[PDB]
PDB file of C-alpha atoms in Angstrom:
ATOM      1  CA  UNK A   1      11.168   1.940   0.442  1.00  0.00           C
ATOM      2  CA  UNK A   2      12.519   4.798   2.553  1.00  0.00           C
ATOM      3  CA  UNK A   3      14.069   2.236   4.888  1.00  0.00           C
ATOM      4  CA  UNK A   4      15.722   0.732   1.822  1.00  0.00           C
ATOM      5  CA  UNK A   5      18.191   3.626   2.063  1.00  0.00           C
ATOM      6  CA  UNK A   6      19.960  -1.210   3.752  1.00  0.00           C
ATOM      7  CA  UNK A   7      19.139  -4.735   2.578  1.00  0.00           C
ATOM      8  CA  UNK A   8      15.502  -5.611   1.703  1.00  0.00           C
ATOM      9  CA  UNK A   9      15.312  -9.385   2.286  1.00  0.00           C
ATOM     10  CA  UNK A  10      16.038  -8.626   5.960  1.00  0.00           C
ATOM     11  CA  UNK A  11      13.309  -6.001   6.214  1.00  0.00           C
ATOM     12  CA  UNK A  12      10.888  -8.879   5.595  1.00  0.00           C
ATOM     13  CA  UNK A  13      12.321 -10.580   8.678  1.00  0.00           C
ATOM     14  CA  UNK A  14      11.334  -7.600  10.800  1.00  0.00           C
ATOM     15  CA  UNK A  15       7.870  -7.086   9.339  1.00  0.00           C
ATOM     16  CA  UNK A  16       7.165 -10.780   9.918  1.00  0.00           C
ATOM     17  CA  UNK A  17       8.618 -10.876  13.430  1.00  0.00           C
ATOM     18  CA  UNK A  18       7.830  -7.358  14.660  1.00  0.00           C
ATOM     19  CA  UNK A  19       4.330  -7.231  13.192  1.00  0.00           C
ATOM     20  CA  UNK A  20       4.059 -10.637  14.842  1.00  0.00           C
ATOM     21  CA  UNK A  21       4.522  -8.939  18.219  1.00  0.00           C
ATOM     22  CA  UNK A  22       1.752  -6.600  17.112  1.00  0.00           C
ATOM     23  CA  UNK A  23      -0.289  -9.573  15.959  1.00  0.00           C
ATOM     24  CA  UNK A  24       0.214 -10.985  19.448  1.00  0.00           C
ATOM     25  CA  UNK A  25      -0.660  -7.947  21.569  1.00  0.00           C
ATOM     26  CA  UNK A  26      -3.816  -7.474  19.481  1.00  0.00           C
ATOM     27  CA  UNK A  27      -4.958 -10.888  20.688  1.00  0.00           C
ATOM     28  CA  UNK A  28      -4.315  -9.861  24.282  1.00  0.00           C
ATOM     29  CA  UNK A  29      -6.430  -6.707  24.010  1.00  0.00           C
ATOM     30  CA  UNK A  30      -9.222  -8.766  22.442  1.00  0.00           C
ATOM     31  CA  UNK A  31     -12.475  -9.188  24.364  1.00  0.00           C
ATOM     32  CA  UNK A  32     -14.129 -12.609  24.250  1.00  0.00           C
ATOM     33  CA  UNK A  33     -17.605 -13.635  25.416  1.00  0.00           C
ATOM     34  CA  UNK A  34     -20.309 -13.731  26.177  1.00  0.00           C
ATOM     35  CA  UNK A  35     -21.660 -17.020  24.850  1.00  0.00           C
ATOM     36  CA  UNK A  36     -25.248 -16.508  25.986  1.00  0.00           C
ATOM     37  CA  UNK A  37     -27.544 -16.154  22.970  1.00  0.00           C
ATOM     38  CA  UNK A  38     -29.030 -13.372  25.100  1.00  0.00           C
ATOM     39  CA  UNK A  39     -25.861 -11.306  24.744  1.00  0.00           C
ATOM     40  CA  UNK A  40     -24.670 -12.526  21.342  1.00  0.00           C
ATOM     41  CA  UNK A  41     -27.466 -10.933  19.320  1.00  0.00           C
ATOM     42  CA  UNK A  42     -26.548  -7.575  20.881  1.00  0.00           C
ATOM     43  CA  UNK A  43     -22.929  -7.914  19.788  1.00  0.00           C
ATOM     44  CA  UNK A  44     -23.646  -9.253  16.304  1.00  0.00           C
ATOM     45  CA  UNK A  45     -25.805  -6.204  15.652  1.00  0.00           C
ATOM     46  CA  UNK A  46     -22.978  -3.927  16.800  1.00  0.00           C
ATOM     47  CA  UNK A  47     -20.701  -5.746  14.355  1.00  0.00           C
ATOM     48  CA  UNK A  48     -23.138  -5.687  11.441  1.00  0.00           C
ATOM     49  CA  UNK A  49     -23.649  -2.005  12.202  1.00  0.00           C
ATOM     50  CA  UNK A  50     -19.969  -1.032  12.241  1.00  0.00           C
ATOM     51  CA  UNK A  51     -19.582  -2.914   8.970  1.00  0.00           C
ATOM     52  CA  UNK A  52     -22.792  -1.780   7.289  1.00  0.00           C
ATOM     53  CA  UNK A  53     -21.780   1.833   7.951  1.00  0.00           C
ATOM     54  CA  UNK A  54     -20.104   3.868   5.208  1.00  0.00           C
ATOM     55  CA  UNK A  55     -22.103   1.952   2.609  1.00  0.00           C
ATOM     56  CA  UNK A  56     -24.879   3.624   0.615  1.00  0.00           C
ATOM     57  CA  UNK A  57     -27.340   1.604   2.713  1.00  0.00           C
ATOM     58  CA  UNK A  58     -26.063   3.031   6.010  1.00  0.00           C
ATOM     59  CA  UNK A  59     -29.140   5.264   6.046  1.00  0.00           C
ATOM     60  CA  UNK A  60     -31.203   2.579   7.748  1.00  0.00           C
ATOM     61  CA  UNK A  61     -28.189   0.797   9.223  1.00  0.00           C
ATOM     62  CA  UNK A  62     -30.312  -1.087  11.757  1.00  0.00           C
ATOM     63  CA  UNK A  63     -32.734  -2.282   9.094  1.00  0.00           C
ATOM     64  CA  UNK A  64     -29.871  -4.237   7.505  1.00  0.00           C
ATOM     65  CA  UNK A  65     -27.808  -5.201  10.555  1.00  0.00           C
ATOM     66  CA  UNK A  66     -30.975  -7.045  11.557  1.00  0.00           C
ATOM     67  CA  UNK A  67     -31.261  -8.724   8.157  1.00  0.00           C
ATOM     68  CA  UNK A  68     -27.736 -10.084   8.621  1.00  0.00           C
ATOM     69  CA  UNK A  69     -27.626 -11.265  12.228  1.00  0.00           C
ATOM     70  CA  UNK A  70     -30.809 -13.258  11.541  1.00  0.00           C
ATOM     71  CA  UNK A  71     -29.732 -15.329   8.543  1.00  0.00           C
ATOM     72  CA  UNK A  72     -26.475 -15.970  10.379  1.00  0.00           C
ATOM     73  CA  UNK A  73     -28.313 -17.271  13.452  1.00  0.00           C
ATOM     74  CA  UNK A  74     -30.007 -20.032  11.466  1.00  0.00           C
ATOM     75  CA  UNK A  75     -27.624 -22.967  10.841  1.00  0.00           C
ATOM     76  CA  UNK A  76     -25.481 -22.836  14.013  1.00  0.00           C
ATOM     77  CA  UNK A  77     -21.700 -22.694  13.584  1.00  0.00           C
ATOM     78  CA  UNK A  78     -20.213 -22.991  11.270  1.00  0.00           C
ATOM     79  CA  UNK A  79     -22.285 -23.407   8.107  1.00  0.00           C
ATOM     80  CA  UNK A  80     -21.748 -22.366   4.491  1.00  0.00           C
ATOM     81  CA  UNK A  81     -23.264 -19.067   3.343  1.00  0.00           C
ATOM     82  CA  UNK A  82     -24.520 -20.710   0.146  1.00  0.00           C
ATOM     83  CA  UNK A  83     -28.012 -21.791   1.178  1.00  0.00           C
ATOM     84  CA  UNK A  84     -29.222 -18.271   1.966  1.00  0.00           C
ATOM     85  CA  UNK A  85     -29.492 -16.618  -1.452  1.00  0.00           C
ATOM     86  CA  UNK A  86     -29.634 -12.835  -1.843  1.00  0.00           C
ATOM     87  CA  UNK A  87     -32.305 -12.299  -4.481  1.00  0.00           C
ATOM     88  CA  UNK A  88     -33.081  -8.746  -5.624  1.00  0.00           C
ATOM     89  CA  UNK A  89     -35.849  -7.036  -7.586  1.00  0.00           C
ATOM     90  CA  UNK A  90     -36.162  -3.455  -8.772  1.00  0.00           C
ATOM     91  CA  UNK A  91     -38.877  -2.178  -6.472  1.00  0.00           C
ATOM     92  CA  UNK A  92     -39.612   1.400  -5.479  1.00  0.00           C
ATOM     93  CA  UNK A  93     -37.689   2.784  -2.528  1.00  0.00           C
ATOM     94  CA  UNK A  94     -35.123   1.633  -0.007  1.00  0.00           C
ATOM     95  CA  UNK A  95     -35.764  -0.192   3.246  1.00  0.00           C
ATOM     96  CA  UNK A  96     -38.439  -2.287   1.562  1.00  0.00           C
ATOM     97  CA  UNK A  97     -35.688  -4.892   1.680  1.00  0.00           C
ATOM     98  CA  UNK A  98     -36.949  -7.411   4.226  1.00  0.00           C
ATOM     99  CA  UNK A  99     -35.540 -10.821   5.109  1.00  0.00           C
ATOM    100  CA  UNK A 100     -37.573 -13.831   4.029  1.00  0.00           C
ATOM    101  CA  UNK A 101     -37.976 -17.079   5.969  1.00  0.00           C
ATOM    102  CA  UNK A 102     -38.890 -18.966   2.806  1.00  0.00           C
TER     103      UNK A 102
ATOM    104  CA  UNK B   1      40.379  22.783 -11.940  1.00  0.00           C
ATOM    105  CA  UNK B   2      37.495  25.254 -12.116  1.00  0.00           C
ATOM    106  CA  UNK B   3      36.606  23.318  -8.969  1.00  0.00           C
ATOM    107  CA  UNK B   4      40.007  23.405  -7.287  1.00  0.00           C
ATOM    108  CA  UNK B   5      40.340  27.050  -8.303  1.00  0.00           C
ATOM    109  CA  UNK B   6      36.850  28.173  -7.324  1.00  0.00           C
ATOM    110  CA  UNK B   7      37.316  26.336  -4.029  1.00  0.00           C
ATOM    111  CA  UNK B   8      40.182  28.709  -3.269  1.00  0.00           C
ATOM    112  CA  UNK B   9      38.246  31.827  -4.300  1.00  0.00           C
ATOM    113  CA  UNK B  10      35.655  30.540  -1.858  1.00  0.00           C
ATOM    114  CA  UNK B  11      38.377  31.032   0.716  1.00  0.00           C
ATOM    115  CA  UNK B  12      39.086  34.452  -0.750  1.00  0.00           C
ATOM    116  CA  UNK B  13      35.426  35.457  -0.962  1.00  0.00           C
ATOM    117  CA  UNK B  14      34.763  34.169   2.562  1.00  0.00           C
ATOM    118  CA  UNK B  15      37.682  32.765   4.545  1.00  0.00           C
ATOM    119  CA  UNK B  16      36.682  29.819   6.720  1.00  0.00           C
ATOM    120  CA  UNK B  17      36.725  26.033   6.499  1.00  0.00           C
ATOM    121  CA  UNK B  18      34.428  23.371   7.947  1.00  0.00           C
ATOM    122  CA  UNK B  19      34.998  19.609   8.033  1.00  0.00           C
ATOM    123  CA  UNK B  20      33.950  17.300   5.214  1.00  0.00           C
ATOM    124  CA  UNK B  21      33.088  13.615   5.141  1.00  0.00           C
ATOM    125  CA  UNK B  22      29.450  14.400   5.831  1.00  0.00           C
ATOM    126  CA  UNK B  23      30.702  15.657   9.182  1.00  0.00           C
ATOM    127  CA  UNK B  24      29.469  19.189   8.571  1.00  0.00           C
ATOM    128  CA  UNK B  25      26.102  17.713   7.592  1.00  0.00           C
ATOM    129  CA  UNK B  26      25.875  15.479  10.665  1.00  0.00           C
ATOM    130  CA  UNK B  27      26.037  18.440  13.049  1.00  0.00           C
ATOM    131  CA  UNK B  28      22.652  19.692  11.849  1.00  0.00           C
ATOM    132  CA  UNK B  29      21.020  16.351  12.607  1.00  0.00           C
ATOM    133  CA  UNK B  30      22.028  16.911  16.233  1.00  0.00           C
ATOM    134  CA  UNK B  31      21.894  20.688  16.679  1.00  0.00           C
ATOM    135  CA  UNK B  32      18.757  21.404  14.643  1.00  0.00           C
ATOM    136  CA  UNK B  33      17.029  18.453  16.334  1.00  0.00           C
ATOM    137  CA  UNK B  34      17.350  20.018  19.790  1.00  0.00           C
ATOM    138  CA  UNK B  35      16.036  23.361  18.544  1.00  0.00           C
ATOM    139  CA  UNK B  36      12.911  21.403  17.591  1.00  0.00           C
ATOM    140  CA  UNK B  37      12.154  19.697  20.900  1.00  0.00           C
ATOM    141  CA  UNK B  38      12.004  23.050  22.673  1.00  0.00           C
ATOM    142  CA  UNK B  39      10.117  24.477  19.697  1.00  0.00           C
ATOM    143  CA  UNK B  40       6.752  22.715  20.064  1.00  0.00           C
ATOM    144  CA  UNK B  41       3.812  23.316  17.732  1.00  0.00           C
ATOM    145  CA  UNK B  42       3.911  22.023  14.162  1.00  0.00           C
ATOM    146  CA  UNK B  43       7.423  23.326  13.488  1.00  0.00           C
ATOM    147  CA  UNK B  44       8.831  20.426  15.478  1.00  0.00           C
ATOM    148  CA  UNK B  45       8.183  17.855  12.763  1.00  0.00           C
ATOM    149  CA  UNK B  46       8.994  20.253   9.921  1.00  0.00           C
ATOM    150  CA  UNK B  47      12.343  21.104  11.541  1.00  0.00           C
ATOM    151  CA  UNK B  48      12.869  17.447  12.442  1.00  0.00           C
ATOM    152  CA  UNK B  49      12.696  17.191   8.661  1.00  0.00           C
ATOM    153  CA  UNK B  50      16.128  18.811   8.426  1.00  0.00           C
ATOM    154  CA  UNK B  51      17.315  15.925  10.563  1.00  0.00           C
ATOM    155  CA  UNK B  52      15.760  13.465   8.121  1.00  0.00           C
ATOM    156  CA  UNK B  53      17.460  15.405   5.349  1.00  0.00           C
ATOM    157  CA  UNK B  54      21.129  16.181   5.947  1.00  0.00           C
ATOM    158  CA  UNK B  55      21.568  12.496   6.770  1.00  0.00           C
ATOM    159  CA  UNK B  56      21.775  11.836   3.018  1.00  0.00           C
ATOM    160  CA  UNK B  57      25.188  13.376   2.372  1.00  0.00           C
ATOM    161  CA  UNK B  58      26.897  11.067   4.878  1.00  0.00           C
ATOM    162  CA  UNK B  59      24.642   8.153   3.909  1.00  0.00           C
ATOM    163  CA  UNK B  60      25.311   8.292   0.159  1.00  0.00           C
ATOM    164  CA  UNK B  61      28.897   9.327   0.819  1.00  0.00           C
ATOM    165  CA  UNK B  62      29.438   6.184   2.883  1.00  0.00           C
ATOM    166  CA  UNK B  63      27.170   3.918   0.821  1.00  0.00           C
ATOM    167  CA  UNK B  64      29.072   4.957  -2.296  1.00  0.00           C
ATOM    168  CA  UNK B  65      31.977   3.230  -0.580  1.00  0.00           C
ATOM    169  CA  UNK B  66      30.068   0.104   0.459  1.00  0.00           C
ATOM    170  CA  UNK B  67      29.834   0.841   4.177  1.00  0.00           C
ATOM    171  CA  UNK B  68      26.462   0.532   5.926  1.00  0.00           C
ATOM    172  CA  UNK B  69      24.495   3.806   5.720  1.00  0.00           C
ATOM    173  CA  UNK B  70      23.022   2.682   9.034  1.00  0.00           C
TER     174      UNK B  70
END
C-alpha cells in the first residue's frame, strides 16, 4: 500500500520473484536428516513440542507431543490421517488424555 | 489574489525566498537524514521519519503531472 505511492501489477512481480529468492535461501539454510528411526523420534518430539506450545494444553507439552509422534509412526509414509480418530469424553482433569492402540 | 497578495506580505513580514518544485522539501530528506545517522538511539528512526515525510510534496507534485514519483 505504502509502496503504491507506483504501479501495483508490477509489485506482484517483485513479491513473486524477490520472495522467491527468500523462498530459495530458506531451503539452503534447511537441515535435513537424520533418517535413522533412532534420531527421528527425537526430532518429531521437538516439532510436536514447538507446535503444541502456546495452546491451552502446553502445560503438559510432552504428554501430547508423545501422543502425536506415536500415531504418526504407525502407517509409514505417507498415509492418510483418517484412520486414527480423535475421540473425546468429558472426564475429570487434564493429562488423563492417553493414546489408545485399539 | 489573497494568495498572490499575502505571498508578498510574506516577503514584507520576513524577506527571504527559497526554491519551489519540492526542491525546498527535498533538502530535508538529505540534511535531516545525516543528522540522524550521527544521532543514534531511538531518535534515528523518528528523525528518519522526516525523510519519509517531506518526500510527499515532490512526489504528489510530480505525480500530479504524471511523472514517476520514484
